[PDB]
Amino acid sequence: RPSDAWPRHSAERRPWAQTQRGGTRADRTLRSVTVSLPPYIAKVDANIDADIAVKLEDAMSEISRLDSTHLAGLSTLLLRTESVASSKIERVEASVDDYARALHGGRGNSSAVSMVAATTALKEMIASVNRDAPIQMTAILRAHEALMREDPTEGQHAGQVRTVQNWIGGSDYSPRNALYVPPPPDTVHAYMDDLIEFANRTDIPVLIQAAIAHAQFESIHPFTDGNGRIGRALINTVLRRRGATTRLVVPLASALVAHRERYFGALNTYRAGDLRPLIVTFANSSRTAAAESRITAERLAEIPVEWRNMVGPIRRHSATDKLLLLLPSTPIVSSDDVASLIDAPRSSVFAAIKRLHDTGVLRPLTNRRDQVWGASLVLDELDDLGHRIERASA
Numbered sequence: 001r002p003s004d005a006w007p008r009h010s011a012e013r014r015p016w017a018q019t020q021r022g023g024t025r026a027d028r029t030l031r032s033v034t035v036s037l038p039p040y041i042a043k044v045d046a047n048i049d050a051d052i053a054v055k056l057e058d059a060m061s062e063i064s065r066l067d068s069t070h071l072a073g074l075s076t077l078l079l080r081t082e083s084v085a086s087s088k089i090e091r092v093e094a095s096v097d098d099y100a101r102a103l104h105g106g107r108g109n110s111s112a113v114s115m116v117a118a119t120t121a122l123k124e125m126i127a128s129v130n131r132d133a134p135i136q137m138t139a140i141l142r143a144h145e146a147l148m149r150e151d152p153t154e155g156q157h158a159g160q161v162r163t164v165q166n167w168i169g170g171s172d173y174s175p176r177n178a179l180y181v182p183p184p185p186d187t188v189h190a191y192m193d194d195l196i197e198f199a200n201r202t203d204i205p206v207l208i209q210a211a212i213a214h215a216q217f218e219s220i221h222p223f224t225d226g227n228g229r230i231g232r233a234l235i236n237t238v239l240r241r242r243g244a245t246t247r248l249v250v251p252l253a254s255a256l257v258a259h260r261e262r263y264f265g266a267l268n269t270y271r272a273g274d275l276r277p278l279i280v281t282f283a284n285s286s287r288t289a290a291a292e293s294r295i296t297a298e299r300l301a302e303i304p305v306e307w308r309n310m311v312g313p314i315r316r317h318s319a320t321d322k323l324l325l326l327l328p329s330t331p332i333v334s335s336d337d338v339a340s341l342i343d344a345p346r347s348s349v350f351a352a353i354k355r356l357h358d359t360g361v362l363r364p365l366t367n368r369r370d371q372v373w374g375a376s377l378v379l380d381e382l383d384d385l386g387h388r389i390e391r392a393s394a
C-alpha cells in the first residue's frame, strides 16, 4: 500500500429493527442497515510522506519543550484546558465560573458537572500508563464510567461497552441516512483488543500512533455515548504511555474544536484509507497546542509577581504570604479550606482573604457563608489559552 495509505473500511448488510417505536414511517419500516467494518490494525505499518514527517517532527519539538518546563499550576491548567475543549466539541459548554464552581463540587450546572467529569476521565486514564504500565481496556471503561456516572438517561450503562447498533447522524430514530454506521456490537470486543494491542506498540512515531489510535477508536465507536471525549482522552494517554509527555497534557482539543468539521472530516478520510488529513490535523493541532501552552507556562510564572505588585508589601511569613503562595496550585479555594490549609489563626487567614479580595487577587464564585474564591488571573489564563490556540489554527 502506498504512502499515507491505510487499509480501508469495508461494509456488510445487517438486519435492523426499531426497538423504540417512533420517527416517521420510513424509520419504522426499515429492516436493514449497512455497517462499516474497520480493519484490524494491530499488525499494520504506515509509511508516510516527508512533508508530514517534518510536521509531526515540529509538533514533537514543541511537545518536548513543553514537557521539560520546570511549575506550580501548569499541569492542572493544561489538563483542564483539554477537558473543557474536548467537551466543547460535543457542545457540552459552560462559563469559566460555572466550571470553576463545578470543580469545587458545585452541581447546579449539569453541563459544568459533565465538564468536570471529562476532566476526571482524562486524569484517571493518563494516570494508568507508562509507569511501565500498558494501555489497558480497564482504564478505558473506568474513564467512560467516570464521565457518564452522573449523566441523565445517558449514563444508564456508564462503564460498559454498547450491546446495540449505533450510528452517527441521519435520522434520529433509525440508521437511515446516517453519515457513519459503526460495526455491530458483537464485534466490539474483538476490535478493542486489536486497538489496545496497536496502542501499545513502540515501533511507530508517537503522534501517528496517537492519531490512528483515536481514529480507530472513533471508528469502532464502542460506547453508546461519549466516544469523542474518551476517544480524545486516549490521545494523551498514548503520548504519556510513550514518554512523549511525562508530567503534562497537550491540549490539542482546543485546536480540534476550532476547526471541528475538518477534524470530523479526517475521520471520514481515515475510513476511506487516507492517512494524510488525519495525521496533518494531528501534527498541526499538537504543534499549536504545545507552543501556546509554553507561553502559558511563562505567563503563569509571571502571575505571582503580578499579584504582589497589586497587594503591596507582604510580610515574609504572614497568612497573606502563605495564601498567595498556595493559590497557583490551588486557585479555587473556600474560606474553610484556606483556613484549614494554612498554619495560621483562622481570623488572620480570613484577613488575608479579604486583603486578596480587596486588592483584586481573589474573586468570589459563590454568595453562599463558606464563600468559594478563585484566582482570577489563573482562571483567566485557562480561558486565554483556549482562545490563543483557536486563533493560531489557520
Ligand SMILES: Nc1ccn([C@@H]2O[C@H](COP(=O)(O)OP(=O)(O)O)[C@@H](O)[C@H]2O)c(=O)n1
Residues within 6 Å of the ligand: 089, 090, 168, 179, 180, 218, 219, 223, 224, 225, 226, 227, 228, 229, 231, 264, 265, 267, 268
Ligand atoms: N464523521 C464523524 C463525526 C464525529 N465522529 C466522532 O464521534 C464523536 C462523538 O461522540 P458520540 O458519537 O459518542 O456522541 P456523544 O455521546 O459524545 O454526545 C465525535 O466527537 C467524533 O470523534 C466520528 O467518528 N465520525
